């Protein structure tokens, strides 16, 4: 069921981003969807965090050049790797938040990839992607909210 | 810069244009239509759509190992696939008829019927000839003009 599985993943993406700290906290957090997704549709109305933050989401340009300034979060679709090449780019520098909506691969681009199918979801960490995002990620992560 | 919002209703605008030369051989009275797979430009057909002719288009995703698309689907907008899953999809189409259109793609000669090409200046789209010639639902061929 993919109605099913997305309201799954925007809850997997809520349990997150409840252990992630920006820097400079918004008023209200970005969320920008860039690529082909299956999952998307929840997130794409729109969320509120527990803490009363609303999360508010876009579909945007893999080339938007501006992704690094306009998104506080970016989920990631399925891109080849030049797309993949030219959005991290675009992040380089800007302290965002990526998540992949598939893990086949997460050595290289986000932060955390997902895993939809199967039982329950999943994820994997890239540390050395954690690493340098600019934003800080609680242990307790690497889903019950914070 | 690339517009993700206007390059959506082309989209749909393009989808309706091509259903027009469409005709199915028991017209439903409802089009149900399926996206499968990751789309980036599905946003807008996913809110439905309406036919010229006042017939609403019901569009709801499906995953791509749903092995009743071919009688839940009377078209199917494709996302992104592998050879091995879109086989599986085209081999639950089998035996029904389906409008198949594809997202994106590097090749249109086998499985969709159309590809969509979303890049460039205006949308344009492929006519895959074979997967049509074999196709129950039947498309008139003025629409074979419009295709580049």
Redo the contacts between chains.
Sequence with gaps: ???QR?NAVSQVLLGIFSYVRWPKEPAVLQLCVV????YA?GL?RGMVQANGRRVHAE??????PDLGTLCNVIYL??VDERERQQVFRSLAGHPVLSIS?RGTECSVGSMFCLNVGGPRITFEANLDSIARSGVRVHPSVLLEHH
């Design positions: 069921s993919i109605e997305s690529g082909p997704t299956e549709d794409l579909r945007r340009a893999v080339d938007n679709g399925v909506e």
